[PDB]
């Protein structure tokens, strides 16, 4: 290669001498609170680095935060908001699945039911939550397909929507995340629709986040240590 028409329309340095490493500290709702390290420019009087850190969103596998592998296919985004010096604190920012698992459960010959709900938690945090469920072939179904009628699908969507609203408005995303880790909402949604339809693989995927009320320092520091 090495070709360039030079249509430009030594002062060289190594940009790692002026850089260093900060540490990512997870919320206490997770076990392995030591997430990793982040590379940052050295602090300058005119522009302090600590301003530049806040707003960063680190993307970490959930299993990397709890040690187990049952949470292998989930993924959590943490938001950098408060820097303690050579160590910074991260608040929950979002949740998602891994595309691998998602495509693994989106298989043919079964109807996927999706529920979407935008709600406000116990605090003024405003969330959007997506739930995905798949109709299950019965343990006796000689019929090969496992489809669900539109009425069953609408009923299931209503049930999932009301359950998600209930479990968001009754807790904060601290408690809500502590609830998400043992995916008890999945079990509850599956149980509440046991009569309507089997519903294999009831999962809560891509817990979004749309608003943050203010900068509340007390609970953020309370969420750590």
């Amino acid at each position: 290669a090495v070709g360039k028409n030079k249509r430009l329309s030594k002062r060289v340095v190594d940009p790692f001498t002026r850089k260093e490493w900060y540490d990512i500290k997870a919320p206490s709702t997770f076990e392995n609170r030591n997430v990793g390290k982040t590379l940052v420019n050295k602090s300058v009087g005119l522009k302090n680095a600590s301003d530049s850190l806040k707003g960063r969103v680190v993307e970490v596998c959930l299993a990397d935060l709890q040690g187990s592998e049952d949470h292998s296919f989930r993924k959590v985004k943490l938001r950098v908001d408060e820097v303690q010096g050579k160590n910074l604190l991260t608040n929950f920012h979002g949740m998602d699945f891994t595309t691998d698992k998602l495509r693994s459960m989106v298989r043919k010959w079964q109807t996927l039911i999706e529920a979407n709900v935008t709600v406000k938690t116990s605090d003024d945090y405003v969330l959007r939550i997506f739930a995905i469920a798949f109709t299950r072939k019965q343990a006796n179904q000689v019929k090969r397909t496992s489809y669900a009628q539109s009425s069953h699908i609408r009923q299931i969507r209503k049930v999932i929507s009301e359950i998600l609203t209930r479990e968001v408005q009754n807790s904060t995303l601290a408690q809500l995340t502590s609830k998400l880790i043992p995916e008890v909402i999945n079990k509850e949604i599956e149980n509440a629709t046991k009569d309507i339809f089997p519903l294999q693989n009831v999962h809560i995927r891509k817990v979004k986040l749309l608003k943050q009320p203010k900068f509340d320092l007390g609970s953020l520091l309370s969420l750590h240590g």
Binding site: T38, L39, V60
Partner: peptide, 9 residues
């Protein structure tokens, strides 16, 4: 890139 992805090396 690092974990954040904001820094490119």
């Amino acid at each position: 890139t690092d974990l954040s992805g904001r820094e490119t090396i």
